Design a binder for this molecule. Structure first.
Ligand code: HEM
Length: 153
C-alpha cells in the first residue's frame, strides 16, 4: 500500500517513540482528551483525573497508553501485513467498549501532534504524510474488521 520509502519514514520516527513509550502515550492521551473531550468518557477509571499533572502521575493511564502504542507499533512494523494483529484489536474495541472510527481519527491526530512536538527534525512533511497514510490504512482495515464482527464503527 505505502511505498517502501514511506514505511521507512514511519518506522524511523517510531524508533524515536520507543525511547520513551510511556511519556509519548501520556502526552497522546492527554492531547486526545483535551482536544476531543467526549473521548474521555470511554475510560471510566480516569474520570477523577482532572489535571494534566494528575493524568501524568496515573500509572493506570500510563499503562493504558503503553498498551495502545505497543499494539500500534507492532502493527506499523508489519508494513500493511497486519490482519492477524487487527482482528483481536478490532474485537477489543468493538464489543463491550465500542470505539468509533472517528475516535481513532482523533487519536491519530494526537499521535501526529505529539510526534511533531517531540521530534520535529525526524518528522517533517514527508514523514507526516507517510504516518498519516499508515494510520489511514490502519483505520480503514480496522473498520472492515469491525463490520465483520457486526459493528458499524
Ligand atoms: C492507535 C489507536 C489505539 C490502539 C492501537 C489501541 C489499542 C488497544 C489495546 C491493545 C487494547 C487492549 C485490549 C485487550 O487487552 O484485549 C485496548 C483497549 C481499550 N481501548 Fe484502545 N487503542 C487505541 C485507541 C483507543 C481510543 C481512541 C479509545 C477511546 C477513545 C480506546 C479505548 C479503549 C478501551 C476503553 C479499551 C478497553 C478498556 C481499557 O483499556 O480501559 N482505544 N486498546
Amino acid at each position: 500500500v505505502l511505498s517502501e520509502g514511506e514505511w521507512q519514514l514511519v518506522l524511523h520516527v517510531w524508533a524515536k517513540v520507543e525511547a520513551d513509550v510511556a511519556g509519548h502515550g501520556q502526552d497522546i492521551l492527554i492531547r486526545l482528551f483535551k482536544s476531543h473531550p467526549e473521548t474521555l468518557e470511554k475510560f471510566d477509571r480516569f474520570k477523577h483525573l482532572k489535571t494534566e499533572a494528575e493524568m501524568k502521575a496515573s500509572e493506570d493511564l500510563k499503562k493504558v497508553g503503553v498498551t495502545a502504542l505497543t499494539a500500534l507499533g507492532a502493527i506499523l512494523k508489519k508494513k500493511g501485513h497486519h490482519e492477524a494483529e487487527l482482528k483481536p484489536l478490532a474485537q477489543s474495541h468493538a464489543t463491550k467498549h465500542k470505539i468509533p472510527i472517528k475516535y481513532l481519527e482523533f487519536i491519530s491526530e494526537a499521535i501526529i501532534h505529539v510526534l511533531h512536538s517531540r521530534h520535529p527534525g525526524d518528522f517533517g512533511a514527508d514523514a507526516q504524510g507517510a504516518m498519516n497514510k499508515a494510520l489511514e490504512l490502519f483505520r480503514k482495515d480496522i473498520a472492515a474488521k469491525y463490520k465483520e464482527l457486526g459493528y458499524q464503527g
